[PDB]
Amino acid sequence: ERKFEKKFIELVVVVDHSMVTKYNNDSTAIRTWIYEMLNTVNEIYLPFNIRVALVGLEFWCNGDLINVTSTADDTLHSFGEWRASDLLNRKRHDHAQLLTNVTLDHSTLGITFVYGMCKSDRSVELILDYSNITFNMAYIIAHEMGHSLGMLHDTKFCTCGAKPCIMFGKESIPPPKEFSSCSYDQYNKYLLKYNPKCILDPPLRKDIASPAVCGNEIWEEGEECDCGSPADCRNPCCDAATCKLKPGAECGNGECCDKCKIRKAGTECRPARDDCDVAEHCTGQSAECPRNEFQRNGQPCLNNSGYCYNGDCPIMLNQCIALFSPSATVAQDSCFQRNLQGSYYGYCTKEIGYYGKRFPCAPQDVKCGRLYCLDNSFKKNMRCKNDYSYADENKGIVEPGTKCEDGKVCINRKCVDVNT
Amino acid sequence: QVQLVQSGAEVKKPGASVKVSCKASGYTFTGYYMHWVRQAPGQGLEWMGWINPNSGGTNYAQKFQGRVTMTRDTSISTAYMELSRLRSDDTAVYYCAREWDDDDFSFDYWGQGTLVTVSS
Amino acid sequence: QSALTQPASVSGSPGQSITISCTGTSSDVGGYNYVSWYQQHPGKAPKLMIYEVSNRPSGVSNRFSGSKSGNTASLTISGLQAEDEADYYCSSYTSSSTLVVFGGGTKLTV
Ligand SMILES: [Ca+2]
Ligand SMILES: [Ca+2]
Ligand SMILES: [Ca+2]
């Protein structure tokens, strides 16, 4: 229905200790398997104009760092916490996925948090290697990653081509290859509402770990040009079948280069998209733009309403708008005192599981726990509504970097002074 | 569990003022509005305004706007209600009804009730 | 007394079922459908049975059910026992100076 603007997801795939032992430490076979399923995933997202470029692989070999359990929710929360604590601090990426051989309860094969694409604690994925063929594997890879983009399980009467679609959830005798018409609108609504700015920029060609393949609309290091399928390449400067530059041309795909010739040094190629998104200028001898950078974290943003944190300006008002309604507002200071109780919903940190010692928040840290938002649209009771569910507990907690008080922001669930 | 305990019964001649206290324990006192309910013997329940234990802001019913003043003590976790210029109609028992999580217009936990009587 | 109107008294038998009516104007009960019911034993503080017309807090028997029809909200009890010899009060949210108003109460004899 629409040609969506071209977005690149940076993915990191982690293999569990159970999975690596199934292949008897044959890392080459695992790498080939991952590359094949990711090629299939890139093939199936072609109509969405979304590319999944693998950035790095993590091998938990001869050890494990999280308590992987048969319960999907527990291990999913544990992996999400571990990811947001270690992987983002160690490796820049957009999405993370765990590959495990441990069977899960109720025969569940994959699970992930919806709408969590750019979220630190909530962009995480769990998949079980249940198939001997890569096609059925990429089926549920695509299903879960589509969940993470805000697309839900397919509702009746949304069948595509008289065949079950990818968002069906339940198994089908032939594995399908296309999303339903009731998914394009959901993706568009997610883009309009949650505004996932973290997947707009393409990754550097030098950072890609996946081997180069011609025709996937991704420019890897080993190839001089990559425009996509030969039947789609409208750029005269390259031919996809040859996968080489047209004679007389100096560029293929890119942002800094324009009009099929390298632009002069000092010309802007990555414009400022936000208050703390400082622009970058071309190096003058490369078609790729320099790595995206932002202003120092801690600068005021959005009319002094918040502080920037890694290129984003988080405020409790925007989170309330996202959670409940376009007219939501942060609740009164009285309701944030409920986090002192350590109740089943009000807490700061808790042990992994349905049960767990939910630690009560500190008296000054009450505003870094749950987020309470006033909304009189649904019902006038519960003046301080909150969103909480055992599947996606982290949703509804204030994002790191939000302004708890003047001169202080919530870092690691604690209201601490800015520019310490 | 949530527990509410109030002061002993008082006898006041007409024209005086009465101050009752309600002690809250087992929960964060500042997080929940503290309503007051007044019941004459043999009659129905009457409502009195709520006090916000965090900010101290108070609302009063139209029947009591000129009579009641409500005060809090966060460091002790007690609420106070003052009723001045008592009249013989004000023979009743008083409960410090609390709100709760799923509804703000309903009261789950009530104090044991203190009885105030006014006569010659 | 208060604005909400309830029947003066009602009686039943342990092997029977009963209904208690609560009524008010459009602003009192009919409009905002936030009615809740209370039960009070002699000498004890009132206890909450149902809220939001039909919703019911945990820790009480299933014999207490609530429903709304126009301006009138009704409470029905089936299988009377010794616990039901108490007073029942109706309360509703009002869009006026008074935030919430209670009922006149009724006496139930088993
Ligand atoms: Ca990115
Ligand atoms: Ca390529
Ligand atoms: Ca930039």
Numbering used by the authors:
A (entry chain A): 195 to 614
B (entry chain H): 1 to 52, 52A, 53 to 82, 82A, 82B, 82C, 83 to 100, 100A, ...
C (entry chain L): 1 to 9, 11 to 27, 27A, 27B, 27C, 28 to 95, 95A, 95B, ...
Question: What do the paper's sentences say?
Answer:
Among these toxins, snake venom metalloproteinases (SVMPs) play a pivotal role, particularly in viper envenomation, causing tissue damage, hemorrhage and coagulation disruption. SVMP PIIs feature an additional disintegrin domain (D), while SVMP PIIIs contain both M and D-like domains, along with a C-terminal cysteine-rich domain (C). Ecarin is an SVMP PIII that activates PT in a Ca2+-independent manner by cleaving the Arg320-Ile321 peptide bond, forming the active meizothrombin intermediate. Notably, the C domain is believed to play a critical role in recruiting specific substrates in both SVMPs and the related ADAM class of human enzymes.
To accomplish this, we solved a high-resolution structure of H11 Fab in complex with rEcarin by cryogenic electron microscopy (cryo-EM). Combining the graphene-grid dataset with our first dataset provided sufficient angular sampling to achieve a reconstruction of the H11 Fab–ecarin complex with a reported global resolution of ~3.4 Å. The final reconstruction reveals that H11 associates with the non-catalytic C domain adjacent to the M domain. Importantly, the C domain is thought to play a crucial role in substrate recruitment and specificity, suggesting that H11 inhibits essential protein–protein interactions necessary for PT binding and processing. The positioning of the CDRH1 and CDRH2 loops provides a scaffold to stabilize the highly acidic CDRH3 loop, which forms the central interaction network of the interface. At the central core of the interface, the remaining charged residues in the CDRH3 loop, Glu95 and Asp100, form a charged interaction network with Arg532 and Arg577, buried within a hydrophobic pocket. In addition to H11 blocking the putative substrate recruitment domain, we also identified a well-ordered density for a peptide bound to the active site of the M domain. Since we were unable to assign a sequence to this peptide, we propose that our structure represents a ternary complex of H11, ecarin, and an unknown peptide that cannot undergo hydrolysis. The long arm of the D domain rotates inwards, facilitating the formation of a small, polar interface between the C domain and the M domain. While the confidence scores representing interface accuracy were too low for us to be sure of the exact placement of PT at the interface, the position of H11 at the C domain in our cryo-EM structure would block association with the 72 kDa PT molecule, regardless of substantial deviations from the predicted complex. These results support a model where H11 sterically hinders a PT association by mimicking the ecarin–PT complex.
